[PDB]
Coordinates of C-alpha atoms in Angstrom, one line a residue:
Chain I
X880 CA 92.1 -29.2 -241.0
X881 CA 94.9 -30.4 -238.7
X882 CA 96.2 -26.8 -238.7
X883 CA 92.7 -25.5 -237.5
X884 CA 92.6 -28.1 -234.7
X885 CA 96.2 -27.2 -233.6
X886 CA 95.3 -23.5 -233.6
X887 CA 92.3 -24.1 -231.3
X888 CA 94.5 -26.1 -228.9
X889 CA 97.2 -23.4 -228.9
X890 CA 94.7 -20.7 -227.9
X891 CA 93.4 -23.0 -225.1
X892 CA 96.9 -23.6 -223.8
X893 CA 97.9 -19.9 -223.7
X894 CA 94.7 -19.0 -221.9
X895 CA 95.1 -21.8 -219.3
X896 CA 98.8 -20.6 -218.8
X897 CA 97.7 -17.1 -217.9
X898 CA 94.9 -18.3 -215.7
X899 CA 97.2 -20.7 -213.8
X900 CA 99.7 -18.0 -213.2
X901 CA 97.1 -15.7 -211.7
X902 CA 95.6 -18.5 -209.6
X903 CA 99.1 -19.4 -208.2
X904 CA 99.7 -15.8 -207.2
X905 CA 96.3 -15.7 -205.5
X906 CA 96.9 -18.9 -203.7
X907 CA 100.3 -17.9 -202.4
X908 CA 99.2 -14.5 -201.1
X909 CA 99.6 -13.9 -197.4
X910 CA 98.3 -11.5 -194.7
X911 CA 101.1 -8.9 -194.9
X912 CA 102.4 -9.7 -198.4
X913 CA 103.5 -6.9 -200.7
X914 CA 100.8 -5.0 -202.6
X915 CA 97.7 -5.7 -200.6
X916 CA 95.2 -2.9 -200.5
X917 CA 91.5 -2.2 -200.3
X918 CA 89.4 -3.0 -203.3
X919 CA 85.8 -2.1 -202.2
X920 CA 83.3 -3.1 -204.9
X921 CA 84.8 -6.4 -206.1
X922 CA 82.5 -8.3 -203.8
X923 CA 79.6 -7.0 -205.9
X924 CA 81.2 -6.9 -209.4
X925 CA 80.3 -10.1 -211.2
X926 CA 81.1 -10.4 -214.9
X927 CA 81.7 -14.1 -215.3
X928 CA 81.2 -16.1 -218.5
Chain O
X1219 CA 91.8 25.6 -189.5
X1220 CA 89.1 27.8 -187.9
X1221 CA 87.6 29.8 -190.8
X1222 CA 84.5 32.0 -190.5
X1223 CA 81.6 31.4 -192.9
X1224 CA 80.7 33.6 -195.8
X1225 CA 77.8 36.1 -195.7
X1226 CA 74.8 36.1 -198.1
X1227 CA 76.5 39.0 -199.9
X1228 CA 79.6 37.1 -200.6
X1229 CA 77.7 33.9 -201.5
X1230 CA 75.5 35.7 -204.1
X1231 CA 78.5 37.5 -205.5
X1232 CA 80.5 34.2 -205.9
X1233 CA 77.5 32.5 -207.6
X1234 CA 77.2 35.5 -210.0
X1235 CA 81.0 35.5 -210.6
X1236 CA 81.6 31.7 -210.9
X1237 CA 83.5 30.6 -214.0
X1238 CA 80.8 28.0 -214.8
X1239 CA 77.5 29.9 -214.3
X1240 CA 75.8 30.5 -217.6
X1241 CA 72.6 32.2 -218.9
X1242 CA 70.3 31.4 -221.8
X1243 CA 68.0 32.9 -224.4
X1244 CA 65.6 34.3 -221.7
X1245 CA 62.9 31.7 -222.1
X1246 CA 59.3 32.0 -220.9
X1247 CA 58.3 30.5 -217.5
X1248 CA 56.5 27.8 -219.4
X1249 CA 59.7 27.1 -221.3
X1250 CA 59.3 28.7 -224.8
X1251 CA 61.7 30.9 -226.7
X1252 CA 60.8 34.6 -226.2
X1253 CA 60.2 36.4 -229.5
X1254 CA 62.9 38.8 -230.7
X1255 CA 60.3 41.6 -231.2
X1256 CA 59.2 41.1 -227.6
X1257 CA 62.8 41.4 -226.4
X1258 CA 63.1 44.5 -228.7
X1259 CA 60.2 46.0 -226.7
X1260 CA 62.1 47.5 -223.7
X1261 CA 59.8 45.9 -221.1
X1262 CA 59.7 42.8 -218.8
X1263 CA 62.4 41.4 -221.1
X1264 CA 65.4 43.3 -222.3
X1265 CA 68.2 42.8 -224.8
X1266 CA 71.6 41.2 -224.1
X1267 CA 74.2 42.2 -226.6
Chain D
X319 CA 88.9 -46.4 -197.7
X320 CA 86.3 -47.1 -200.3
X321 CA 87.5 -44.2 -202.5
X322 CA 91.1 -45.5 -202.1
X323 CA 90.0 -48.9 -203.2
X324 CA 88.9 -47.6 -206.7
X325 CA 92.1 -45.6 -207.2
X326 CA 94.2 -48.7 -206.4
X327 CA 92.1 -50.8 -208.7
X328 CA 92.1 -48.2 -211.5
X329 CA 95.8 -47.8 -211.4
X330 CA 96.1 -51.6 -212.0
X331 CA 93.9 -51.3 -215.0
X332 CA 95.9 -48.4 -216.4
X333 CA 99.2 -50.3 -215.7
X334 CA 97.9 -53.4 -217.4
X335 CA 97.1 -51.3 -220.4
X336 CA 100.9 -51.1 -221.0
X337 CA 100.9 -54.7 -222.2
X338 CA 100.1 -53.1 -225.4
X339 CA 102.6 -50.6 -226.9
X340 CA 105.4 -53.2 -226.3
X341 CA 108.1 -52.7 -229.1
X342 CA 107.5 -56.3 -230.4
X343 CA 103.6 -56.1 -230.2
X344 CA 103.4 -52.9 -232.2
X345 CA 105.7 -51.0 -234.5
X346 CA 105.5 -47.3 -233.8
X347 CA 107.6 -45.6 -236.4
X348 CA 109.8 -42.6 -235.6
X349 CA 108.0 -39.3 -234.8
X350 CA 109.3 -35.8 -235.4
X351 CA 107.9 -33.9 -232.5
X352 CA 110.7 -31.4 -232.5
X353 CA 109.8 -29.4 -235.6
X354 CA 108.5 -26.1 -236.9
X355 CA 105.4 -27.3 -238.6
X356 CA 104.8 -25.9 -242.1
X357 CA 101.0 -25.8 -242.4
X358 CA 101.3 -22.4 -240.6
Chain Y
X803 CA 89.5 -7.9 -195.2
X804 CA 92.3 -6.3 -197.3
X805 CA 93.7 -9.7 -198.4
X806 CA 90.3 -11.1 -199.3
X807 CA 89.5 -8.1 -201.5
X808 CA 92.9 -8.3 -203.1
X809 CA 92.3 -11.9 -204.0
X810 CA 89.0 -11.1 -205.5
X811 CA 90.4 -8.3 -207.6
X812 CA 93.2 -10.5 -208.9
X813 CA 90.8 -13.3 -209.9
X814 CA 88.7 -10.7 -211.8
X815 CA 91.6 -10.7 -214.3
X816 CA 91.2 -14.3 -215.6
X817 CA 90.8 -14.6 -219.4
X818 CA 87.6 -15.1 -221.4
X819 CA 86.9 -18.8 -221.2
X820 CA 88.6 -19.0 -217.8
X821 CA 86.4 -16.3 -216.3
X822 CA 84.4 -18.8 -214.4
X823 CA 82.2 -18.6 -211.4
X824 CA 84.0 -21.2 -209.2
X825 CA 83.3 -22.3 -205.6
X826 CA 86.3 -20.4 -204.5
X827 CA 84.8 -17.2 -206.0
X828 CA 81.6 -17.8 -204.0
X829 CA 83.6 -18.6 -200.9
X830 CA 85.6 -15.4 -201.2
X831 CA 82.5 -13.2 -201.6
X832 CA 81.0 -14.9 -198.5
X833 CA 84.2 -14.3 -196.6
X834 CA 84.2 -10.6 -197.4
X835 CA 80.6 -10.5 -196.2
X836 CA 81.4 -12.2 -192.9
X837 CA 84.4 -10.0 -192.2
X838 CA 82.2 -7.0 -192.6
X839 CA 79.7 -8.5 -190.1
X840 CA 82.4 -9.2 -187.6
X841 CA 83.7 -5.6 -187.8
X842 CA 80.2 -4.3 -187.2
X843 CA 79.7 -6.5 -184.1
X844 CA 83.0 -5.4 -182.7
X845 CA 82.1 -1.7 -183.2
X846 CA 78.7 -2.3 -181.5
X847 CA 80.4 -3.8 -178.4
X848 CA 82.9 -0.9 -178.4
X849 CA 79.9 1.6 -178.2
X850 CA 78.3 -0.5 -175.4
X851 CA 81.6 -0.5 -173.5
Chain Q
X1360 CA 100.5 25.7 -197.0
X1361 CA 98.3 28.6 -196.2
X1362 CA 98.2 30.9 -193.1
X1363 CA 95.4 33.2 -192.1
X1364 CA 95.7 36.8 -191.1
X1365 CA 93.0 39.0 -189.4
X1366 CA 92.6 42.3 -191.3
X1367 CA 91.1 45.3 -189.5
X1368 CA 89.9 48.7 -190.9
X1369 CA 88.7 47.2 -194.2
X1370 CA 85.4 47.7 -196.0
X1371 CA 84.8 44.1 -197.0
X1372 CA 86.7 41.3 -195.3
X1373 CA 87.8 40.5 -191.7
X1374 CA 90.4 37.8 -192.6
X1375 CA 92.9 36.8 -195.3
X1376 CA 94.1 33.5 -196.6
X1377 CA 97.6 33.9 -198.2
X1378 CA 99.1 31.1 -200.2
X1379 CA 102.8 30.2 -199.6
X1380 CA 105.3 27.5 -200.4
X1381 CA 107.8 26.0 -197.9
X1382 CA 111.0 24.5 -199.5
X1383 CA 113.2 22.1 -197.4
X1384 CA 116.8 21.9 -198.5
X1385 CA 118.2 18.5 -197.7
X1386 CA 121.9 19.4 -198.2
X1387 CA 122.2 21.4 -194.9
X1388 CA 118.8 20.9 -193.3
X1389 CA 117.5 24.4 -194.1
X1390 CA 114.2 25.9 -194.9
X1391 CA 112.7 28.7 -197.0
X1392 CA 109.3 30.3 -197.3
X1393 CA 108.2 32.0 -200.5
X1394 CA 104.8 33.6 -201.4
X1395 CA 103.9 33.3 -205.1
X1396 CA 102.6 36.6 -206.4
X1397 CA 98.9 37.1 -206.7
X1398 CA 97.7 39.4 -209.4
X1399 CA 95.9 42.3 -207.8
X1400 CA 96.5 41.7 -204.1
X1401 CA 97.9 44.9 -202.5
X1402 CA 100.3 42.8 -200.3
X1403 CA 104.0 43.2 -201.1
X1404 CA 104.8 39.5 -201.8
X1405 CA 107.9 37.5 -202.5
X1406 CA 110.2 35.6 -200.1
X1407 CA 108.7 35.7 -196.7
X1408 CA 111.7 34.1 -194.9
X1409 CA 115.3 33.7 -196.1
Chain K
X317 CA 49.6 28.6 -213.6
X318 CA 52.4 30.4 -211.9
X319 CA 52.2 30.8 -208.1
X320 CA 52.4 34.5 -208.8
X321 CA 48.9 34.4 -210.3
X322 CA 47.7 35.9 -207.0
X323 CA 48.5 39.4 -208.1
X324 CA 47.5 38.9 -211.7
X325 CA 44.6 41.2 -212.7
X326 CA 42.3 38.6 -214.3
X327 CA 39.6 41.3 -214.4
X328 CA 41.8 43.2 -217.0
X329 CA 44.6 41.1 -218.5
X330 CA 44.0 37.9 -220.3
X331 CA 45.9 34.7 -219.3
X332 CA 49.1 34.5 -221.3
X333 CA 52.4 32.5 -221.6
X334 CA 54.0 34.8 -219.0
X335 CA 51.4 33.6 -216.4
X336 CA 50.8 29.9 -217.3
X337 CA 53.2 27.3 -215.8
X338 CA 51.9 24.2 -217.6
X339 CA 49.8 23.5 -220.8
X340 CA 47.3 20.8 -221.5
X341 CA 49.1 18.2 -223.4
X342 CA 49.0 14.7 -224.9
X343 CA 50.6 13.2 -221.8
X344 CA 47.3 13.9 -220.1
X345 CA 45.1 12.6 -222.9
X346 CA 45.8 8.8 -222.5
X347 CA 43.2 6.2 -222.9
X348 CA 41.5 4.6 -219.9
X349 CA 41.7 7.4 -217.4
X350 CA 39.5 10.5 -216.8
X351 CA 40.7 14.1 -217.3
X352 CA 39.0 17.2 -216.0
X353 CA 38.5 20.2 -218.4
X354 CA 36.6 23.2 -217.0
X355 CA 35.0 21.0 -214.4
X356 CA 34.0 18.2 -216.9
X357 CA 35.4 14.9 -216.0
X358 CA 35.4 13.6 -219.6
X359 CA 36.3 9.9 -219.3
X360 CA 38.2 8.7 -222.4
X361 CA 36.3 5.9 -224.0
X362 CA 38.8 4.9 -226.7
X363 CA 40.8 6.4 -229.6
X364 CA 41.7 5.8 -233.3
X365 CA 44.0 3.3 -234.8
Chain P
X72 CA 102.4 10.4 -195.3
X73 CA 99.2 11.8 -193.9
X74 CA 96.0 12.1 -196.0
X75 CA 95.8 15.3 -198.0
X76 CA 93.3 18.1 -197.6
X77 CA 92.0 20.7 -199.9
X78 CA 93.3 24.3 -199.6
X79 CA 90.8 27.1 -199.0
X80 CA 90.5 29.9 -201.6
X81 CA 90.9 33.6 -201.0
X82 CA 87.4 35.2 -201.0
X83 CA 88.8 38.6 -201.9
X84 CA 90.4 37.2 -205.1
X85 CA 87.2 35.3 -205.9
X86 CA 85.2 38.6 -205.5
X87 CA 87.7 40.4 -207.7
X88 CA 87.5 37.8 -210.5
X89 CA 85.8 39.0 -213.7
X90 CA 82.6 37.3 -215.0
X91 CA 81.7 35.0 -217.9
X92 CA 80.8 37.2 -220.8
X93 CA 79.1 34.5 -222.9
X94 CA 75.7 33.0 -223.6
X95 CA 74.0 29.7 -224.4
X96 CA 72.0 29.0 -227.6
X97 CA 68.4 27.7 -227.5
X98 CA 66.6 24.7 -229.1
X99 CA 65.3 25.0 -232.6
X100 CA 61.8 23.3 -232.2
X101 CA 60.1 26.6 -233.2
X102 CA 56.5 27.0 -234.2
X103 CA 57.8 27.0 -237.8
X104 CA 59.3 23.6 -237.6
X105 CA 56.4 22.2 -235.6
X106 CA 54.0 23.5 -238.3
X107 CA 56.1 22.4 -241.2
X108 CA 56.5 18.9 -239.9
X109 CA 53.4 18.1 -238.0
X110 CA 50.7 19.6 -240.3
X111 CA 47.6 17.5 -241.1
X112 CA 48.2 15.3 -238.0
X113 CA 45.5 15.3 -235.3
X114 CA 44.5 12.9 -232.7
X115 CA 40.9 11.9 -232.1
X116 CA 39.8 10.5 -228.7
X117 CA 36.3 9.3 -227.9
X118 CA 35.0 10.3 -224.6
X119 CA 31.8 10.5 -222.4
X120 CA 30.6 13.1 -219.9
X121 CA 28.6 11.9 -217.0
Chain V
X1071 CA 62.9 0.1 -281.6
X1072 CA 59.8 1.9 -280.3
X1073 CA 59.0 3.7 -277.1
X1074 CA 56.1 3.2 -274.8
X1075 CA 55.8 6.4 -272.8
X1076 CA 54.4 7.8 -276.0
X1077 CA 51.0 6.4 -275.0
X1078 CA 50.7 8.5 -271.9
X1079 CA 48.5 11.6 -272.0
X1080 CA 49.0 14.7 -270.0
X1081 CA 46.0 14.0 -267.8
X1082 CA 47.6 11.1 -266.1
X1083 CA 51.1 12.6 -266.1
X1084 CA 49.6 15.5 -264.2
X1085 CA 47.0 13.6 -262.1
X1086 CA 48.0 10.3 -260.3
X1087 CA 46.8 8.7 -257.2
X1088 CA 48.5 10.0 -254.1
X1089 CA 51.1 7.5 -252.8
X1090 CA 63.8 15.3 -245.2
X1091 CA 65.9 12.2 -244.3
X1092 CA 65.3 9.3 -241.8
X1093 CA 68.0 10.6 -239.4
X1094 CA 66.2 14.0 -239.5
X1095 CA 63.0 12.1 -238.9
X1096 CA 64.4 10.2 -235.9
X1097 CA 66.1 13.3 -234.5
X1098 CA 63.0 15.6 -235.0
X1099 CA 60.8 12.9 -233.3
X1100 CA 62.9 12.7 -230.1
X1101 CA 62.6 16.5 -230.0
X1102 CA 58.8 16.2 -230.0
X1103 CA 58.7 13.8 -227.0
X1104 CA 61.2 16.2 -225.5
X1105 CA 58.4 18.8 -225.6
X1106 CA 55.3 16.7 -225.6
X1107 CA 56.2 14.6 -222.5
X1108 CA 58.5 17.2 -220.9
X1109 CA 57.7 18.1 -217.2
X1110 CA 59.3 20.8 -215.2
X1111 CA 61.2 20.1 -211.9
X1112 CA 61.9 22.2 -208.8
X1113 CA 65.7 22.4 -209.5
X1114 CA 66.5 22.6 -205.8
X1115 CA 69.1 25.4 -205.7
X1116 CA 68.9 29.1 -204.8
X1117 CA 69.2 31.2 -208.0
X1118 CA 70.3 34.8 -208.5
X1119 CA 66.8 36.3 -209.0
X1120 CA 65.4 35.1 -205.6
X1121 CA 67.8 37.4 -203.7
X1122 CA 69.9 37.4 -200.6
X1123 CA 67.7 35.7 -198.0
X1124 CA 67.4 32.6 -200.2
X1125 CA 71.2 32.3 -200.0
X1126 CA 71.2 30.9 -196.4
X1127 CA 70.3 27.3 -196.7
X1128 CA 73.7 25.7 -197.9
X1129 CA 76.3 26.5 -195.3
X1130 CA 79.8 27.1 -196.7
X1131 CA 83.1 28.5 -195.6
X1132 CA 86.1 29.7 -197.7
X1133 CA 87.1 26.0 -197.8
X1134 CA 84.4 25.0 -200.2
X1135 CA 85.0 27.6 -202.9
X1136 CA 86.3 26.5 -206.2
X1137 CA 84.1 23.3 -206.8
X1138 CA 82.5 23.3 -210.2
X1139 CA 78.8 24.3 -210.2
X1140 CA 79.4 26.2 -207.0
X1141 CA 77.2 24.8 -204.2
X1142 CA 78.0 22.0 -201.7
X1143 CA 77.3 18.6 -203.2
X1144 CA 74.1 17.1 -201.7
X1145 CA 73.5 14.0 -199.6
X1146 CA 70.6 -9.5 -195.6
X1147 CA 70.9 -11.3 -192.3
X1148 CA 72.7 -9.0 -189.8
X1149 CA 74.6 -10.3 -186.7
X1150 CA 73.4 -7.3 -184.6
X1151 CA 70.0 -8.9 -184.3
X1152 CA 69.8 -11.6 -181.7
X1153 CA 69.8 -15.2 -183.0
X1154 CA 69.3 -18.6 -181.5
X1155 CA 71.2 -21.9 -182.1
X1156 CA 69.8 -22.9 -185.5
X1157 CA 69.8 -19.3 -186.9
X1158 CA 73.2 -18.0 -187.9
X1159 CA 74.9 -16.3 -190.9
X1160 CA 75.8 -19.7 -192.4
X1161 CA 72.0 -20.6 -192.2
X1162 CA 71.3 -17.5 -194.2
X1163 CA 73.9 -18.7 -196.7
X1164 CA 72.8 -22.3 -196.4
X1165 CA 70.6 -22.0 -199.5
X1166 CA 72.0 -19.5 -202.0
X1167 CA 75.5 -20.9 -202.1
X1168 CA 76.2 -24.4 -203.7
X1169 CA 74.5 -26.1 -200.7
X1170 CA 70.8 -25.8 -201.0
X1171 CA 69.3 -26.5 -197.5
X1172 CA 66.0 -24.7 -196.7
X1173 CA 64.6 -24.5 -193.2
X1174 CA 61.1 -26.0 -192.3
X1175 CA 59.7 -23.4 -189.9
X1176 CA 57.4 -26.0 -188.2
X1177 CA 60.4 -28.2 -187.2
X1178 CA 63.3 -25.8 -187.1
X1179 CA 66.1 -28.3 -187.2
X1180 CA 64.7 -30.1 -190.4
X1181 CA 66.2 -28.7 -193.5
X1182 CA 65.3 -29.7 -197.1
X1183 CA 67.8 -30.1 -199.8
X1184 CA 66.8 -28.8 -203.2
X1185 CA 68.8 -31.4 -205.0
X1186 CA 67.1 -34.6 -204.0
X1187 CA 68.4 -38.0 -205.0
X1188 CA 65.0 -39.3 -206.3
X1189 CA 62.2 -36.7 -206.8
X1190 CA 60.0 -39.5 -208.3
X1191 CA 60.1 -41.2 -204.9
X1192 CA 59.0 -39.2 -201.9
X1193 CA 61.1 -36.4 -200.6
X1194 CA 64.0 -36.6 -198.2
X1195 CA 65.4 -34.3 -195.5
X1196 CA 68.4 -33.6 -193.4
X1197 CA 68.5 -33.3 -189.6
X1198 CA 70.4 -30.6 -187.7
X1199 CA 71.9 -31.9 -184.4
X1200 CA 71.1 -30.8 -180.9
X1201 CA 67.6 -29.2 -181.1
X1202 CA 64.6 -30.0 -179.0
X1203 CA 61.1 -31.5 -179.5
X1204 CA 57.8 -30.8 -177.7
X1205 CA 54.5 -32.8 -177.6
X1206 CA 56.2 -35.7 -179.5
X1207 CA 55.7 -34.2 -183.0
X1208 CA 54.9 -37.5 -184.7
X1209 CA 56.3 -37.3 -188.2
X1210 CA 58.4 -40.1 -189.4
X1211 CA 60.4 -38.4 -192.2
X1212 CA 63.4 -39.5 -194.3
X1213 CA 66.8 -38.3 -193.1
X1214 CA 69.8 -39.1 -195.3
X1215 CA 73.5 -38.8 -194.5
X1216 CA 74.7 -40.3 -197.9
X1217 CA 73.4 -42.0 -201.0
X1218 CA 74.1 -45.7 -201.6
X1219 CA 73.2 -49.2 -200.4
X1220 CA 71.4 -49.9 -197.1
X1221 CA 74.2 -52.2 -195.9
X1222 CA 77.6 -51.0 -197.2
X1223 CA 80.8 -53.0 -197.3
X1224 CA 83.0 -50.1 -196.3
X1225 CA 81.5 -48.7 -193.0
Chain A
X1375 CA 108.6 6.8 -182.7
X1376 CA 112.1 6.8 -184.1
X1377 CA 112.5 3.0 -183.9
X1378 CA 109.1 2.7 -185.7
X1379 CA 110.5 5.0 -188.4
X1380 CA 113.5 2.8 -188.9
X1381 CA 111.3 -0.4 -189.2
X1382 CA 109.1 1.4 -191.8
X1383 CA 112.2 2.2 -193.9
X1384 CA 113.5 -1.4 -193.8
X1385 CA 110.1 -2.8 -194.7
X1386 CA 109.9 -0.4 -197.6
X1387 CA 113.2 -1.6 -199.1
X1388 CA 112.1 -5.2 -198.6
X1389 CA 108.9 -4.7 -200.5
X1390 CA 110.7 -3.0 -203.4
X1391 CA 113.0 -6.0 -203.7
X1392 CA 110.1 -8.4 -203.6
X1393 CA 108.4 -6.6 -206.5
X1394 CA 111.5 -6.9 -208.7
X1395 CA 111.8 -10.6 -207.7
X1396 CA 108.2 -11.3 -208.7
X1397 CA 108.6 -9.6 -212.1
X1398 CA 111.8 -11.5 -212.8
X1399 CA 110.1 -14.8 -211.9
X1400 CA 107.2 -14.0 -214.2
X1401 CA 109.5 -13.2 -217.1
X1402 CA 111.6 -16.4 -216.6
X1403 CA 108.4 -18.5 -216.5
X1404 CA 107.3 -17.0 -219.9
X1405 CA 110.8 -17.7 -221.3
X1406 CA 110.9 -21.3 -220.0
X1407 CA 107.4 -22.0 -221.4
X1408 CA 108.4 -21.1 -224.9
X1409 CA 108.8 -23.8 -227.6
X1410 CA 109.6 -24.1 -231.3
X1411 CA 105.9 -24.7 -232.2
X1412 CA 104.6 -21.7 -230.4
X1413 CA 102.6 -18.6 -231.4
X1414 CA 104.4 -15.2 -230.9
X1415 CA 107.7 -16.9 -231.8
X1416 CA 109.6 -14.2 -233.8
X1417 CA 113.0 -13.3 -235.0
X1418 CA 115.4 -10.7 -233.5
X1419 CA 115.6 -7.0 -233.8
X1420 CA 118.6 -4.9 -234.8
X1421 CA 119.6 -2.1 -232.4
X1422 CA 122.9 -1.3 -230.8
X1423 CA 123.1 0.8 -227.6
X1424 CA 125.9 -0.1 -225.1
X1425 CA 124.2 0.7 -221.9
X1426 CA 125.5 -0.5 -218.4

């Protein structure tokens, strides 16, 4: 049972790790930063959970 | 950059000679298969071998 | 100012909750955090 | 407009449980909308000029 | 690139569109122009310019 | 029928599949709406289970 | 780099191309299949004429 | 040690009450609707049999040749509209987004929040600043800047 | 026009270096985040190349 609980916690930690990395890169973006381009459609695409 | 348009002769010949244009089993105007004996009768429908 | 008042008060209550866990009030035994757990 | 669309694209990559509709997501969508309206107003004034 | 030539005294067309490739040699800043051979076009094709 | 029915000799030749464009069909016989056959409006009462 | 453009084709070569000597097969909902699988099925509709 | 189909005569074994594959049944059936409910369409493109004069509607040059199926391919608050002080883009967004203020058209600077602090008690509203009143409009209506006690210690 | 061209070239080199920097930072973050009690922890692989 302890193994099952730890497995759930490990998945949660890995997912939050990836999400935090993406959110940091989004927060620190700037107006003429590298790799900024048009992405028409993303303002209408909505596939949240 | 200035190009003259194509004539009706050329346009019809290109449509006839297109790689993608296809023909079918010579259906009726209503949309039914035309009988093989009808096509054998050398009349309003012919044979395509 | 009213939101600060709670956070100052609440930090006191969290701080006073360290009167427990004193090495003479409890006996925590040693803990093997650095391990490769075997329940896999 | 470019940087807003880039932020939205990157935040589409969040993992399954983290794929959340957050207030920042709403704000970015609204920001893209407003930038488009601003561009339209400027083009209108250009034509009038 | 393509370049267009007017053709007189023909039954069918009054213009051509010949297809050609321009190579730029960096070593010496030179250029060359070569026409790839089309199957049944009656033009003598090959290297347009040395 | 086909729009080319104008030069169809109805006084000699019978109506055939080479001259009809559409056929009376179960899409037209649907309960609750009238349908005209030979100038008879024939309102559909009801149908079978 | 400037945005690319599509190159025009040579109408003479398009005219000289050879055709598509092929054909497309029909559906198989023949009268035989319709008879063999929809026999003994009729639809009865009550109606009135005014 | 004995068998029971013995006591069955040939009359029954001949005469009994009347009682392909399902995929064949499902496939064959979609092929009946594909005939029974089929309707023809104009197919708006000049074909070979109509002849040369029909081949004048789509304009093309030698540039367009080569495309598959050879023919040219065929064919909310806006800020352009004038708006007054209480009407703006943010007012258009003032309800869908996580703030839920809705305008009352009788008194334009009186918005209603959807999330009221106490629906059991009578409703409450928010007041937009500026604005203008005519003919004294006597409605004494709740406005609320925050939720809490009437006389706060920290003000 | 020529000065503009030179600025474009310098900007291009700077962007390239920025991309490699970001990738290296991401890899180092993943490496720093590892722990003994972690999934995907695995042994080595045997391969000999000598490549400069």
